[PDB]
Design a protein around this ligand. Structure first.
Ligand SMILES: NC(=O)C1=CN([C@@H]2O[C@H](COP(=O)(O)OP(=O)(O)OC[C@H]3O[C@@H](n4cnc5c(N)ncnc54)[C@H](OP(=O)(O)O)[C@@H]3O)[C@@H](O)[C@H]2O)C=CC1
Ligand SMILES: [Ca+2]
Length: 298
C-alpha cells in the first residue's frame, strides 16, 4: 500500500508544531531487534534514511524530538540544517549500538528547531539518574524564545529504559527528569512540552508521576479519543521472535494551563498498517511519529 504519511490525518482539536519520533537506530534495526516478518531489504540504511526525511518533510514541524538517532552527524544534522533546523545531539553513555560489528556509533536523543522561528535561550544535556544511580538514559531540555512574540517555552526530549522488569527503574528516571524540569522552568513559570519514548504503558508508575506532577502536564494524544480521557491504543506495533508487540510508549506532555492542543496526527488502522506491521518497505520505524500543533493560551 501507500506510505503511512499519505494515510494519517490531522484531527482538528502562529501555531507551533511539535513532532515526537523514536526513529529506530540503524544498528539496532539490523542487529538486535529481530524483526522476523520485516524484509531485510526494507531495513537498509539508504532506504530508511530517505523514509525518515520524507516523514519530516511531510509534516514541516517547528520542533523535532527524536530518539535512537545513530546517524546524527552524518545525516540528520547536516540535512536538516540545510532546511533551517538548529540541532543538538546527546548520546547514551553506553549505547547498545556499539554491540553491532558494523554500527555507526552510539544512539541518543536529538532536538531540532527552526532557527527562523526561535532563539535558543538555554540548553541542558541531562544524564538521568535513578535515586542517584547514574543510568544509561539521557534527556535534552532547551528554553526557546519565539522571535515573533517573545514568548519563552521549554522543550524536552527523553528515552527511558526499555523492557519489562524496569518499572521501578523507569519511575526513578522520570522523577529525576521532572526534578530537572522543575529547576529549568523556574517552578512552571515557563511553559513546558516534554516529548519522549517512555518505554512504559499508561499503567506504569512513571506515567502516573507525570500525570500527577505539580507541573500540571497533560498528554496531547489523549485528545484523539472520543472524550479526550484515554491514551491511544498504540504508538508502536511490530512482530518479534518473542511475538507481536502492540502498545503505547510514546507521549507528548504539555502544560495544561499554558498551552492548547490545536491538532494531532491520527494513527493507522489495523487494515492500513498491513499484516506485517512496522517497519516495512514504506515506513522506517516500529514507532509512529506523533505530531501536534500547539498555541499559547490568550
Ligand atoms: N558498549 C559496549 O561495549 C557494550 C554494550 N552493552 C550494553 O547493552 C545495554 C543496552 O543499552 P540500553 O540503553 O539499556 O537499552 P534498553 O534496554 O533501554 O532498550 C533496548 C533497545 O532495543 C529496543 N528493544 C525493545 N525491546 C527489545 C527486545 N525485546 N529486544 C531487543 N531490543 C529491544 C529498544 O527500543 P524501544 O525503546 O522502542 O523499546 C531499545 O532501543 C547498554 O547498557 C550497553 O552498555 C552490552 C555489552 C558491551
Ligand atoms: Ca527500538
Amino acid at each position: 500500500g501507500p506510505p503511512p504519511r499519505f494515510q494519517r490525518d490531522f484531527v482538528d482539536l502562529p501555531p507551533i508544531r511539535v513532532m515526537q519520533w523514536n526513529i529506530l537506530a540503524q544498528a539496532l534495526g539490523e542487529g538486535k531487534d529481530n524483526f522476523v516478518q520485516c524484509p531485510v531489504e526494507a531495513l537498509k540504511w539508504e532506504e530508511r534514511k530517505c523514509l525518515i526525511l520524507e516523514e519530516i518533510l511531510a509534516y514541516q514541524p517547528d520542533i523535532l524530538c527524536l530518539q535512537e538517532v545513530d546517524h546524527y552527524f552524518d545525516t540528520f544534522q547536516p540535512l536538516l540544517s540545510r532546511l533551517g533546523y538548529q540541532g543538538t545531539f546527546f548520546p547514551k553513555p553506553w549505547s547498545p549500538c556499539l554491540d553491532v560489528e558494523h554500527n555507526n556509533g552510539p544512539d541518543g536523543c536529538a532536538l531540532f528547531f527552526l532557527q527562523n522561528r526561535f532563539k535558543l535561550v538555554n540548553s541542558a544535556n541531562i544524564r538521568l539518574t535513578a535515586m542517584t544511580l547514574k543510568t544509561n538514559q539521557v534527556a535534552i531540555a532547551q528554553t526557546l524564545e519565539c522571535k515573533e512574540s517573545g514568548r519563552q517555552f521549554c522543550i524536552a526530549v527523553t528515552h527511558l529504559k526499555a523492557r519489562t522488569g524496569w518499572e521501578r527503574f523507569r519511575s526513578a528516571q522520570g522523577c529525576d527528569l521532572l526534578q530537572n524540569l522543575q529547576n529549568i522552568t523556574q517552578g512552571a513559570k515557563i511553559p513546558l512540552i516534554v516529548c519522549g519514548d517512555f518505554n512504559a504503558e499508561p499503567t506504569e508508575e512513571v506515567y502516573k508521576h507525570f500525570a500527577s506532577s505539580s507541573l500540571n502536564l497533560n498528554s496531547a494524544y489523549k485528545l484523539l479519543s472520543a472524550d479526550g480521557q484515554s491514551e491511544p491504543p498504540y504508538t508502536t506495533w511490530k512482530i518479534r521472535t518473542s511475538g507481536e508487540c502492540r502498545h503505547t510508549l510514546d507521549y507528548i506532555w504539555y502544560s495544561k494551563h499554558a498551552l492548547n492542543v490545536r491538532s494531532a496526527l491520527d494513527l493507522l488502522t489495523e487494515e492500513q498498517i498491513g499484516p506485517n506491521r512496522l517497519p516495512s518497505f514504506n515506513y522506517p520505524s516500529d514507532h509512529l511519529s506523533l505530531v501536534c500543533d500547539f498555541s499559547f493560551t490568550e
